Amino acid sequence: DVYAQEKQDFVQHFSQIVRVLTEDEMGHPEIGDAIARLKEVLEYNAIGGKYNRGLTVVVAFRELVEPRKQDADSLQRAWTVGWCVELLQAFFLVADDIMDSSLTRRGQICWYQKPGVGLDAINDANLLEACIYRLLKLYCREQPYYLNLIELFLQSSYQTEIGQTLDLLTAPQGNVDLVRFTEKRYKSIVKYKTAFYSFYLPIAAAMYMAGIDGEKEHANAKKILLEMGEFFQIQDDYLDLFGDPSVTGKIGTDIQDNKCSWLVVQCLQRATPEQYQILKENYGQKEAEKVARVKALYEELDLPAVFLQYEEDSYSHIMALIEQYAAPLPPAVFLGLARKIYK
Amino acid sequence: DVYAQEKQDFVQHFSQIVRVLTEDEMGHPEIGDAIARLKEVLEYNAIGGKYNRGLTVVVAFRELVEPRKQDADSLQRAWTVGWCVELLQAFFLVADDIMDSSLTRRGQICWYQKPGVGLDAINDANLLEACIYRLLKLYCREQPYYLNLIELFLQSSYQTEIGQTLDLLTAPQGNVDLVRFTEKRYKSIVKYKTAFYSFYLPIAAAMYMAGIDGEKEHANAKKILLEMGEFFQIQDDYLDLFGDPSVTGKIGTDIQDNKCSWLVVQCLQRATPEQYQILKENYGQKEAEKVARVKALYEELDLPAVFLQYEEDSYSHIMALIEQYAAPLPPAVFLGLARKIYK
Ligand SMILES: O=P(O)(O)C(O)(Cc1cccnc1)P(=O)(O)O
Ligand SMILES: O=P(O)(O)C(O)(Cc1cccnc1)P(=O)(O)O
Ligand SMILES: C=C(C)CCOP(=O)(O)OP(=O)(O)O
Ligand SMILES: C=C(C)CCOP(=O)(O)OP(=O)(O)O
Ligand SMILES: [Mg+2]
Ligand SMILES: [Mg+2]
Ligand SMILES: [Mg+2]
Ligand SMILES: [Mg+2]
Ligand SMILES: [Mg+2]
Ligand SMILES: [Mg+2]
């Protein structure tokens, strides 16, 4: 597996990430305590994921750039830009866990739930964001793609925040209005909150580093990647309820938080007026027995089978899009990524 | 007053800010609801302040740039960059109010206290931040100083967040350890949390737009401006307790929040072991009667007189620094700003 190959090299690079980020302290001992906190935040929140996004930058880089230009310096920059995407991920998740009132992340207590952290986590998340641009400046400032990367990260952050706004607006706490939960709305939420930053960004970053800046090449890459992103969020929604917290590393909250989940949207498409009543009575509440009633209804409508069938139809469709839109990029780039997220 | 002149033109420009920010919606009706929320957030949180920071960009621009280069386009860009600093301010304040558990801001209820907003305000704050860079791209991308402005805003944000980390670390909730509250620590907190973004940033932005990018000119400007920033935070700390909420627009929380305020640092310098006990017993608690005991001790030590005397010594010192370090920039730039914040 081409991700497995690159992994060990990528993950060890995090030591260098932390080192150069906390040598800002050398020239200013006055901020020592802040730099120590930064290190803690990084070590807690940027480590322990699958690294799909960061590894994708490196894999795509190695597949897009002529082996004659893969010197030690160019490789260090690739790992760094990969870690920038992982820091973006950490920024979004620390804040998302606060807003979604979640308990665990990646198999440990959410950072804001940690004793003595609490809403201070808001500033910690913003620091993670800031570190992206410090890394970009330190490693990439004299490269021709520097400004393109800066604008890409900024734009991806804006899109993600717009998506989060839609997520939160569609799920007002205490106000169960199931008519809002349409497929059209679902698709817009996930495109913005997940697809751009999780799928387009890491490949686009590699493309810029390879000198592929053409409007057309990026537009074609998007057509494939945003579709993969939709599937990825749908899988996340399924896993919120039907996943084993021991494997996912996080306790589900979509029902309690009144979210426009793929599951609730599919339920509303199949529900008799009497099933609709059950949903309306038990959705968006914290009571464990009410959540259990919604899961039992999902199970009745065979939603887990409907998801299985969506996964298969989706894989076939993404493969068709790769056949059409990959060129002039190597299909391997997209095939590797697809194999990582479906199987 | 040269701020008063420029004001009406600057403030009316906010209509154009909001318009171009919410025409992102024209090409994507799917995110309409998010764009409506963005508009609300802007109108609530970017309006109602003194605009000292944003006006400073415009004033300095008009004083630094040859009147022959102050066309309508260059002026529109100046107003925009001014509004970018006001958006940065709004980002920091929305988040700061959450973290500091504050009640009002600029004479209205804090955004996160508004019914139906709550911790969703975390994402709203991040959107304010994102809008800075959208404005910079839309108005300034083809100008020679574009990248310098982008790096300036990013770096100022990082410094501010480091400062906020020190603020929050020095004020752990429920853990009153008054020995931490030294002048040396106070000075480091305020330099980072306030001085860079409030004083250096707006002048530096004008300098870059005027083509003054020299290391030396910026280093000299900092020497003056960071000192002004220290005074400005000290005045803020005094006003938290001794200001009239009807004028300041915000209810004070420093005592309740266990903060390393200039006032508590000055108290510890003057206090008998028996006054020290009083402080230690009543500081960092929410009880109105305990807060009242701390204010009465401050009044005993004549802290309000000590502040008056600091204000005067500080004005004289800043004026001495202007005499030394302003050149080759016009002293008016710094004098105008000083007159705005002292009187
Ligand atoms: O990991 P989570 O919390 O299940 C999630 O995927 C996290 C997340 C944050 C931001 C953007 N996309 C996904 P969410 O959308 O809250 O279900
Ligand atoms: O307006 P406030 O809340 O009194 C304050 O000045 C706001 C603030 C936020 C961020 C940086 N500097 C000041 P704080 O430091 O919390 O006392
Ligand atoms: C956008 C989503 C669905 C958040 C989870 O992403 P991942 O499942 O890739 O989380 P980590 O590997 O980074 O933990
Ligand atoms: C950095 C500080 C002390 C926050 C308040 O700044 P201002 O007093 O300039 O607040 P507004 O005019 O923007 O309301
Ligand atoms: Mg979540
Ligand atoms: Mg969420
Ligand atoms: Mg989820
Ligand atoms: Mg505050
Ligand atoms: Mg504060
Ligand atoms: Mg204050």
GROMACS .gro file of C-alpha atoms and ligand atoms in nm, chain B residues 49-50 53 89 93 106 194 197-198 232-233 236 250, ligand 4:
model
   27
  392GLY     CA    1  -1.663   5.067   1.845
  393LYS     CA    2  -1.441   5.377   1.830
  396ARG     CA    3  -0.749   5.090   1.469
  432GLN     CA    4  -1.063   4.322   1.640
  436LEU     CA    5  -1.338   4.023   2.101
  449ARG     CA    6  -2.010   4.801   2.313
  537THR     CA    7  -0.275   4.392   2.280
  540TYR     CA    8  -0.241   4.414   1.684
  541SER     CA    9  -0.381   4.737   1.830
  575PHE     CA   10  -0.367   5.132   2.637
  576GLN     CA   11  -0.405   4.795   2.812
  579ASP     CA   12  -0.832   4.913   2.994
  593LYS     CA   13  -1.888   4.663   2.898
  690LIG     C1   14  -0.737   4.575   2.313
  690LIG     C2   15  -0.847   4.627   2.398
  690LIG     C3   16  -0.815   4.706   2.525
  690LIG     C4   17  -0.993   4.588   2.364
  690LIG     C5   18  -1.074   4.711   2.357
  690LIG     O1   19  -1.027   4.792   2.248
  690LIG     P1   20  -1.109   4.925   2.220
  690LIG     O2   21  -1.137   4.996   2.349
  690LIG     O3   22  -1.032   5.002   2.106
  690LIG     O4   23  -1.254   4.868   2.171
  690LIG     P2   24  -1.347   4.919   2.054
  690LIG     O5   25  -1.341   5.069   2.034
  690LIG     O6   26  -1.311   4.842   1.922
  690LIG     O7   27  -1.489   4.882   2.107
   0.00000   0.00000   0.00000
